[PDB]
Amino acid sequence: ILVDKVFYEKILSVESFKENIITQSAIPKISNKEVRLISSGSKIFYAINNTSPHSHVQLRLNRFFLSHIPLNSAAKAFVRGGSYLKYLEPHIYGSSYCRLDISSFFNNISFDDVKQSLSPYIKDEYLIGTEQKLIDAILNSVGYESPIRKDKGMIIPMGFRTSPAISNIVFRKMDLLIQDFCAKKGVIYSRYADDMLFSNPRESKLLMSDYFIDEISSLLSIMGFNINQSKYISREKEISINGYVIENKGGNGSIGTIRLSKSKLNTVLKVTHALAQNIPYKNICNKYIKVRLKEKNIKYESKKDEFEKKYYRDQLINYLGGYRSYLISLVKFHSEYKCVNSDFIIQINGILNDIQNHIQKIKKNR
Amino acid sequence: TIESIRVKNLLSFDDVILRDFRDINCIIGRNNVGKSNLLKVIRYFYAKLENKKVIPLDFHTNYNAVGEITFTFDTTRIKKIVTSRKNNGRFHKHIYNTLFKSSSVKLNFEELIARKNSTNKSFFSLTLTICKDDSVMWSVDDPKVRSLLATLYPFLYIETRHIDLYDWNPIWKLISNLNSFNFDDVDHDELVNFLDEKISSRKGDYKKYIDRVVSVIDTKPYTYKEKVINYIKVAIKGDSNKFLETLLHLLITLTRTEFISPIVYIDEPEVGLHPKLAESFVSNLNKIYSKFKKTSELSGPGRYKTPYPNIFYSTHSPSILKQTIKLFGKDQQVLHFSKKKDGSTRVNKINSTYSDERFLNIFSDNEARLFFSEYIVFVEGATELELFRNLSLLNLYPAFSLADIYDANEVILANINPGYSKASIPFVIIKDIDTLIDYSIKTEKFSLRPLFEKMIKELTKEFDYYDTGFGRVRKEIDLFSDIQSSTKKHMDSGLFFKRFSLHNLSSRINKVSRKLNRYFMTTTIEGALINEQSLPYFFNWIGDVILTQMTINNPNPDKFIEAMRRRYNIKSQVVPLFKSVFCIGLNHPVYSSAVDKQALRIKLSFLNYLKRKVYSDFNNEKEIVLALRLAFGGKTETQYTLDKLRKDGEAELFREKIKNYKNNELFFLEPQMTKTSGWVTTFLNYTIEKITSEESDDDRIRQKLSFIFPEIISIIEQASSSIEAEESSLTG
Amino acid sequence: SNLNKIYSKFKKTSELSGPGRYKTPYPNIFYSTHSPSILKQTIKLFGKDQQVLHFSKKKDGSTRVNKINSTYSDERFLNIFSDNEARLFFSEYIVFVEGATELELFRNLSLLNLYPAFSLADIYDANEVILANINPGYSKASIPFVIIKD
Amino acid sequence: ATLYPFLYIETRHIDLYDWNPIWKLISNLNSFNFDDVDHDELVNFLDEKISSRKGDYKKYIDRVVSVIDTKPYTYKEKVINYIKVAIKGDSNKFLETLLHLLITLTRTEFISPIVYIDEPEVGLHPKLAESFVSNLNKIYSKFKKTSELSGPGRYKTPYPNIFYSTHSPSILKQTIKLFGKDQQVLHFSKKKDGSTRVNKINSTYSDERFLNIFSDNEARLFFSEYIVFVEGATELELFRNLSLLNLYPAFSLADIYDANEVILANINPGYSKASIPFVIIKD
RNA sequence: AGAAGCUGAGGAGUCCAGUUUGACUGGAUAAGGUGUUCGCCAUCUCUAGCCUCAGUAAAAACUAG
DNA sequence: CAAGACCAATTACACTCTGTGAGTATTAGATGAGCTAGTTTTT
């Protein structure tokens, strides 16, 4: 699609950035006080204020603009219809597996690459007089100057709602290059965010060789992306990715299988066992479900209290329903693609039956 | 025996996977481009299997550098054949040296012991990747494997629209490939000597002629295929629909003592064929399919247990599909292609197996027509068939004509199971409120039918977390549960409701059941036609009858009219005179000017008298609507019919009035006061003609129709919106 | 449908007049169709302005040309007209029955397997009104028929 | 591709019911801008000049277009239609017209195409082939400017390259005699292991008398696998004897030519030594 | 030579190792068994393997039989 | 560290010279309420 001035007049800035358009006012950038800087580990998440024009502009961009730009089929994340199961599905046909991760994927995306990627889809015309164009007006609502990273340019925040679509759009040249390189050598390539999974069906040591890593690094160096050696995994006939086990016994066309290890399902089994042992709900959610009431309970306004029991009923029901949704998403993926172990299927059927029984018990108790 | 065909980023396929293939797989749909692209993909894959220089297929989008075609073969029969000890043959060893060799030598002495239980199935996957630089490579880098796969599972394409009768290339190819005889042991010299001995005026006369002919036409030696073709031609005594049927029979017969499993694709088998010819073709295919089948008690020579080759059809004729469903049964499937919103072919399996034998046996052209549809409206009743197939109404709405109206009860709906094919063939089930709730005058209480309780149970969203917006469903379910109270007072001898309104309940039920593709009307089908706003037009319709369908019986009209006037009073005895003068007659003779004026005056007087009597006997101006509704087999707001009211002994005075009008005043309309009498068609035609005469623009006509018929026009507009929402998908 | 629409767009009869309306006779159009859909649409849309010709053969071998009834005086039958009614034209023997039980019996696959000849005859469920509208007696030589009643 | 286009003309499998190369050349080789012309005015004028009242033909065209649902013409199709309307007209004649049109079009443009004509003599009398070559030469010379030959119709634009695939000595003889130094003869033959060669056979002669005398006998030498050069007619009588050649079915594949020293020098058999083996027999 | 690490701050009891007679520092409860490409892996069986306070933004698939 | 390999999509001859591709040369019922929020991946 192509976005001209009139499109931005009443679609992406219908009400928010309207007063600036009429009164010959350049659209401002994002101020420091307009964002929060939350922390989790050694990671910084930029949270934009909900009541802000930039948030509305980002929502309209993600609904109308950043939803029609073509992407690469290897991008299985942040795309309507993409999923982790679809990210792991194509590798069932391979015998050798390799996993790579791009280090600081969102922080290493140069703003010039984003500008050059979004230029073909935005008309190169001035918006607010002969002061500001239309491309930079769109970009001002996407990026943010990070005080932590000094004056190194407009770094794409890791918490903005427009970040995933922009990342997938800008990582299309690299996706095409890597896909072509793997096609020339018979390697199946799939990317989820910044995890790249490569599968080789043939009996070769290409994925375990340093040449493959060197080629991937050389390709990624075009746009300035590196890969950390901490989580480089090269294995044969079996690979575990965050509990998802892909296993192929090998051959000349044998079909692999995808299952989930007991480590992935350990928490739900512990919860079900605790429910079987009639453990009180006080310590089944503050230990297993890592959900707990804060000290500032009942907003420091009510006096009835007693909300702890109903909270520990509600949140437990929600957790059981969500994990049930996860398991039945797995079984529907199996029905659609037929790449899941039968014993794992019967095991998750039994677990689903147990979860349904426990949900019925909890709802009867309330 | 393929089990999976996957196409990614080629032609019109983004990611399309085909599975659960059967013997008589049939392909239908308006997206002929999709069928052509699938056939091109299959032909390209099988050409690249045999190493033929062909143009690579185009990508669906250029933002992908890879185009994949994945074929999965069920190598279970072949593995069992080659694994057995008593199969020490060169070809058997060749098969168990390239396919089932890499997966056996690399395993220990435990894995294979679980593969001899005669219960597991073996799959062989082969992937063709087309790169951006027009370079094609395979998952397995062994041409022997590809050649063996092509030989074991060949692909045959038969085109009937462009078929040459003189050339029998597929027949001779099948004969040469499918044989169990070695022709290398035949001595050409011995055969020539035998021929010479057969025709010999002297010893050694044909030999010199043969030598001279060979010398004067000396060319390249015959190949094995040419030799076997010539031997078959001299061995046999003989060289559109008949050609294809013979080819299919030959292929089926040959594939009875061979482990080769061919794949047959036939495009448009019914071009230039009578429907009986297509039905006979499918019947002959089923006969040859069943003749070579042995099941338990069925045994003896001539019957085999060899799996049948997969046959693919591309048919636009409902006859072939109907016969395939009726005869084959569980050994067939129907694949609908259609398209997507952005433009991309889909493949969905349409329900073709029915658990009811009666439905399968009485399966007809309408049921096969439902599969060649883009929107099906399921109705219970022939009156709805009359109303929604009215030609005079469809021309004003050139979007509901694309929808097909089907009369089906609950059993037929369950057999068809439209929910299985929902994204391919959108459907709406139109029913009445009486199928959900029921009312009793003697016990003044609502009751819930099992259908409504089943729908509620289906809509109970248990085993669910908390999400925004999905909070009022539980409240609606609770309200639909608690409306079962007995507090509902009925006035007018149990005909109306004092405070309750079924309009709001019907609207709420429709709102909650929109997601289940069901629409429930407030009243019966006659309710939407006979309403208050339709009272004038309906009355005019009655007048039309009095002016059209009833003519003078006597051959001399003037004398009879004069005698009746001098004998019967024109004012007090007007009804007996009208009954004795006008009768039922299709012809409309033209009388004298005075006679015509007298007849018109009498008709106008009778119309005025009936209008005055109707307005005087009933005062509320609404009870007449209910009376007319119950006259034509309708229902009240209490969900009671005239017969049910008669059996329950309710509204005795109302039934007496209805009887008086039927047997005294509206006696000429008695034949039309029954269902399936065609009164709906006549009333709609007359109303539409009158509105067209009054209003000029078609938009005004549609607005007037919406005013007079709110529910019918609402349903039509909803169906039209549903069709136009997916117009770009269900259209070639 | 498009043919009928363009046919009716240029018709000037009775009160229908105005620019773009012509009273000139339309050209004769002949169709060689093997599909019930075209036939049923032609019938339902034209009515009195169409006819159906059945060819068949003779005993010694000679082409015939007969007319099959296609004009119906009942508007209900014309509107309800569906694929089942259009299939009777493409038939060589019609068995008329009153009742769905007879349809179940005469369409039984197991019974028809042992009687291949009767499988060539199609069974239609019609009352006296439908029989009168169809009028099978108009085309007896072209389409033989039997009416089975109680 | 657009500056050095390639054209292929197969005379053996040509069709007289289509003019695809001609219309392609006309559409591609133009110096005009068939865009200023607008359909509306064209129609308006046709309606004004055709018949009946004003606007009747415009209404007819509009009602025909509104009910046909056809995509608009491309530039090539539009210019082809304009040329067809503007002109009053619709094997050897077809080829001559195509070459003349191509030369005339390529005399005012920097596009230099390359033509390849396969079998220009199929179904043609030898006189017809000679006339074809003579007409092409006349077209070539008509547009040639050289000192005194200056004025209208004389251009210095280089001529397009033309390749022949001929099996007739008449075409070769006419090309050698007429074109002179602006022609080349290529002999392919094969190698020992099997591989096509490309050699140049001497077709330019410094003797004008030899060029004028040049006849079918000289042109037959180009289609010979072995030439025996002799000095008198007695050798011709001896080595062309049918009875002697009947017993030796290998010397009949070699042609005998009577040539003196001047003729041998003009022919120069040593140039095409590897292509056409030769022996010079002298007393 | 730069990456990586890591939701943070802690606390109670006990063990090991080191210094040290008297206290501190470092590591630790997903438990046990089996096989492993030794991986942060897989599989099997239970009684299910510690507590408190702060922080928790974004985009996708999934609420089926 | 530093690096080859850096996506795809975005019918035409003006000119003085009418033939040439320079030469010049033209030429100018509004006031107690009172409330939580899924799994998993990226991270």
Swiss-Prot record, chain A:
Keyword Cytoplasm: no
One GO BP: defense response to virus
InterPro entries: DNA/RNA_pol_sf, GrpII_Intron_Splice-Mob/Def, Reverse_transcriptase_msDNA, RT_dom
This enzyme's EC code(s): 2.7.7.49
One Pfam family in the UniProt entry: RVT_1
Domain of life per record: Bacteria
Keywords: Antiviral defense, Magnesium, Metal-binding, Nucleotidyltransferase, RNA-binding, RNA-directed DNA polymerase, Transferase
Binding site for Mg(2+): D101, D194, D195
GO molecular function, one term: metal ion binding
Domain Reverse transcriptase, residue spans: 19-246
Record field: catalytic activity: DNA(n) + a 2'-deoxyribonucleoside 5'-triphosphate = DNA(n+1) + diphosphate
Purpose of the protein: Reverse transcriptase (RT) component of antiviral defense system retron Eco8, composed of this RT, the following endonuclease and a non-coding RNA (ncRNA) encoded between them. Expression of retron Eco8 confers protection against bacteriophages T4, T6, T7 and SECphi4, SECphi6 and SECphi18. At multiplicity of infection (MOI) of 0.02 cultures slow growth when infected with SECphi4 but do not collapse, at MOI 2 cultures collapse. Responsible for synthesis of msDNA (a branched molecule with RNA linked by a 2',5'-phosphodiester bond to ssDNA).
Similarity comment: Belongs to the bacterial reverse transcriptase family.
PANTHER family documented for this protein: NUCLEAR INTRON MATURASE 1, MITOCHONDRIAL-RELATED, RNA-DIRECTED DNA POLYMERASE
Name the UniProt record assigns to this protein: Retron Eco8 reverse transcriptase
Annotated organism of origin: Escherichia coli
Curated annotation (Swiss-Prot), chain B:
Cofactor mode of binding and number, as noted: Probably binds 2 metal cations.
Cofactor(s) named in the record: a divalent metal cation
Residues that bind a divalent metal cation 2: E384, S605, E623
Keywords: Antiviral defense, ATP-binding, Hydrolase, Metal-binding, Nuclease, Nucleotide-binding
Span list, region ATPase domain N-terminus: 1-172
Residues at which a divalent metal cation 1 binds: E380, D432, D434
Annotated region described as Toprim domain, given as residue ranges: 373-686
UniProt xrefs under NCBIfam families: retron_eff_Eco8
Listed name of the protein: Retron Eco8 OLD nuclease
Organism: Escherichia coli
